[PDB]
C-alpha cells in the first residue's frame, strides 16, 4: 500500500530550530530566510563594488 510510504528521518540534516516536530517552524522562518537573504544582498554589493 502507498500508505506504507513514510518520509525518512532527516533529523541529521535539519537546522536545530526545526528539530522539534511538536513546534511550528513558522516561528523561525523569518530568521532562517533573513540569514540566506543577508548572504545574497552582501554578495551583490561586493560584486557591484
Amino acid at each position: 500500500s502507498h500508505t506504507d510510504i513514510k518520509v525518512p528521518d532527516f533529523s541529521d540534516y535539519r537546522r536545530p530550530e526545526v528539530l522539534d516536530s511538536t513546534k511550528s517552524s513558522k516561528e523561525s522562518s523569518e530568521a532562517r530566510k533573513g540569514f540566506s537573504y543577508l548572504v545574497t544582498a552582501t554578495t551583490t554589493v561586493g560584486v557591484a563594488y
Binding site: I5, Y13, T40, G46
Partner: protein
C-alpha cells in the same frame, strides 16, 4: 665560461607581497642614474614628469629637466635648436644611435635601462650582484682588452668597467655613498623605472584579497544552500513484487 653563478636573494624592502618601494631610495637611485649611469646608458621610456609624486615634487623635477638641453624645432627658419628640458621630455640619450654607443664603448653596447630589471632573470638581485660583484679574474683566465671579470655576468666577461665605488657621487640627503649603498639605491630606482605600477598593483592586490576573502565564502555558502536539496535527497525503489 659556461658555468653560471646565480645572484642570491636580497631582502629588498619591496620584496614582500604588500611591500611598496622605498621612495627615498628611489630618489637616491635616480641621482645615481643621473650622475653615473646616464653617461653610457639611455633610459628611453622614462620622462621627467614620471618622477613627480614618486621621488621629486613637480618643482624639483622641473629644475632637474632644466639642467639639460634638448633639441627642439624646426623653428620658423626650419632649423633645429637647443632649449632647456621640461617635464614632458624623456631622459636624454647619451648617444645618437647604438653604433655610436658601441664605438664609444670598445664595441660593447650599454643596453637601455628602462626595463633592465624586468629584462634579466634575477631582477635587482642580479643587477645588485653584478654592480658589487667585480673582482680580479681567477687564475688561468685572461680577458681580451676592454673586458672585465664579473662572476655574475654570463660568461664572466663584461664590457662595462666597474661603474660605482665609494663616493662615486654625493647624495642630496647626506647618506654615506658607499658602493653597496649606491648599488642598493640605483637598483631600487631601476625597479621603479621598469615597473612604475609596482606600488599601485600591491595596494589593489590587498583590496582584491580582502574582497575575495568575503565573496568566496559567501558564494560558496550560496552553492551549498542550493545544493543541499540534492545532497540530502533520499531515494527508494518500490517495484511491484
Amino acid at each position: 665560461s659556461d658555468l653560471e653563478l646565480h645572484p642570491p636573494s636580497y631582502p629588498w624592502s619591496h620584496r614582500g607581497l604588500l611591500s611598496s618601494l622605498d621612495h627615498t631610495s628611489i630618489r637616491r637611485g635616480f641621482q645615481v642614474y643621473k650622475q653615473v649611469c646616464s653617461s653610457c646608458h639611455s633610459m628611453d621610456y622614462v620622462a621627467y614628469r614620471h618622477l613627480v609624486g614618486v621621488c621629486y615634487t613637480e618643482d624639483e623635477a622641473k629644475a632637474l629637466a632644466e639642467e639639460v638641453e634638448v633639441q627642439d624645432g624646426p623653428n620658423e627658419d626650419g632649423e633645429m635648436f637647443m632649449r632647456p628640458g621640461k617635464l614632458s621630455d624623456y631622459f636624454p640619450k647619451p648617444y645618437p644611435n647604438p653604433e655610436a654607443a658601441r664605438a664609444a664603448n670598445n664595441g660593447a653596447l650599454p643596453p637601455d635601462l628602462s626595463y633592465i630589471v624586468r629584462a634579466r632573470h634575477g631582477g635587482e638581485d642580479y643587477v645588485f650582484s653584478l654592480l658589487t660583484g667585480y673582482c680580479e679574474p681567477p687564475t688561468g683566465v685572461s680577458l681580451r682588452e676592454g673586458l672585465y671579470f664579473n662572476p655574475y655576468f654570463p660568461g664572466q666577461a663584461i664590457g662595462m668597467a666597474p661603474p660605482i665605488y665609494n663616493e662615486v657621487l654625493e647624495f642630496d640627503d647626506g647618506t654615506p655613498a658607499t658602493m653597496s649603498q649606491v648599488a642598493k639605491d640605483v637598483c631600487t630606482f631601476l625597479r621603479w623605472a621598469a615597473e612604475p605600477e609596482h606600488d599601485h598593483r600591491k595596494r589593489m592586490g590587498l583590496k582584491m584579497l580582502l574582497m575575495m576573502g568575503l565573496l568566496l565564502p559567501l558564494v560558496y555558502a550560496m552553492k551549498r544552500h542550493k545544493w543541499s536539496v540534492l545532497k540530502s535527497r533520499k531515494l527508494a525503489y518500490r517495484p511491484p513484487k
